[PDB]
């Protein structure tokens, strides 16, 4: 049959394949090429000191056990092929609770080219820690990070790198800005080495620079405070003998100020 040719290609690829071992376990390091397409920078929760981000998480690595010779150079396969091969165990260091979307079918991608180069895209919604120093609140700016790296494989086993230039390896979509309080100024990346109890690991960093707006606070706090002070400023213009009127000016301004 016409479809038996690709079936036996996949069955020949998975024959004798150990998915528990990374490519070149005892011979080299598995370089993983990573880039991120942010489809929406979600709302920043100031109470939890966190932010939400939806991203296309793309990783690419060379595997030599997945070489084939056939009529099609790229095998655009589904998600069931992804669990049958080795994939890197990338996790977010400062993530709190993230969901990999699986509606309707697991939101994953797998493309095996003929030289063995892979590509593995995912949809995630990362709730990551953004520690905030609110000394200049509400006129503050933050650099909320997004740190990801391998969980089990050390620096001598799996290293991470950006597939494009580092200035162009985190792309934020134009319509994708769900920020209502802040506004996104730009991105900032950097690789690095983190020392842990187990060993040294390669952690890739993505700093999102934010800047809050006083819009909500120059109408809820600052302006009702100015109007409260000004309404106590008109009590000097009343009569001296009007004791209860200037008294109710004083007590109502003190109550409005303390309830604000």
């Amino acid at each position: 049959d016409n479809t038996t040719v690709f079936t036996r290609i996949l069955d020949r690829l998975l024959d004798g394949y150990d998915n528990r071992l990374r490519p070149g376990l005892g011979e080299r390091v598995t370089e993983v090429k990573t880039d991120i397409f942010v489809t929406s920078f979600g709302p920043v929760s100031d109470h939890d000191m966190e932010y939400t981000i939806d991203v296309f998480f793309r990783q690419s690595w060379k595997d030599e056990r997945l070489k084939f010779k056939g009529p099609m150079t790229v095998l655009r396969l589904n998600n069931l092929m992804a669990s049958k091969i080795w994939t890197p165990d990338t996790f977010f260091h400062n993530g709190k609770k993230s969901v990999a979307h699986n509606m309707t079918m697991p939101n994953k991608l797998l493309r095996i080219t003929e030289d063995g180069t892979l590509l593995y895209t995912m949809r995630l919604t990362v709730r990551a820690e953004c520690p905030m120093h609110l000394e200049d609140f509400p006129m503050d700016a933050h650099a909320c990070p997004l740190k990801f790296g391998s969980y089990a494989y050390t620096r001598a086993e799996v290293v991470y790198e950006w597939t494009r230039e580092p200035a162009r390896s985190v792309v934020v979509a134009e319509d994708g800005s769900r920020l209502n309080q802040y506004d996104l100024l730009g991105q900032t990346v950097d690789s690095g080495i983190v020392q842990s109890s187990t060993g040294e690991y390669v952690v890739m960093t993505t700093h999102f620079h934010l800047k809050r707006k006083i819009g909500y606070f120059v109408i809820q706090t600052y302006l009702p405070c100015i109007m409260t002070v000004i309404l106590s400023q008109v009590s000097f213009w009343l009569n001296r003998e009007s004791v209860p009127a200037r008294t109710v000016f004083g007590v109502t301004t003190v109550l409005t100020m303390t309830t604000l």
């Epitope: 290293v159 790198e161 230039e165 580092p166 200035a167 900032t188 990346v189 950097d190 690789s191």
Partner: antibody
Framework: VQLQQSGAELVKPGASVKLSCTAS????????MYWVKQRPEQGLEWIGR????????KYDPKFQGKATITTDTFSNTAYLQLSSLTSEDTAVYYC???????????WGQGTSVTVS | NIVMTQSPKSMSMSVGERVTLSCKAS??????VSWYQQKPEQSPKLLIY???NRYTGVPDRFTGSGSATDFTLTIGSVQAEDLADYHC????????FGAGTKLEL
Amino acid sequence: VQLQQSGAELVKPGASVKLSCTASGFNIKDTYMYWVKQRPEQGLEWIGRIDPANGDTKYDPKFQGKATITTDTFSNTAYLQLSSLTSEDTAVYYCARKGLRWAMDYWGQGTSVTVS
Amino acid sequence: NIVMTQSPKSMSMSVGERVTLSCKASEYVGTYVSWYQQKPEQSPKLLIYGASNRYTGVPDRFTGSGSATDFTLTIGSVQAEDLADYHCGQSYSYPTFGAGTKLEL
């Protein structure tokens, strides 16, 4: 592991020159190939970028049009085209492999071009 | 573009003491600089990648360092065979290079 380039060239100004370097010991489809200009007693100047697996090329804005980068798969070779050669184009050219952490790992021996 | 402003042009000291270099970036490059050596009549060779990562074959005397904007390369007890020109480059964006720091006796 070795990047062997072409020889030295000497043509009249206003002409065109073919310049090439052959990579051995690996394949150029994995890493980017970077071209750089070294004027004598001056600093290095980056020419452009090529990704041979995708075929995409990115160039410096001051080198757009006068220079372009091509490649092929079977010979595992990166090429330059230079057009409208002038006196300030007299320099030595290296092709540099993209390395670990974007570092320009390997370098060629160098081809010196000269006009008269 | 990103502008590399490594200084000075050349330094002229003897053999066996500490000499440091400096590379200053116009815009942010985060730990993606690289340092090369340039002997007369010789192709460049890599020394440091990242910010301070020592390449294979580099002696231990060559110590680099870096930050978000300021970068440096410290030499401990420079010898006679190290008399060459040094280059600072970046690759956080499309790659650029500095002018060049030389060494003299």
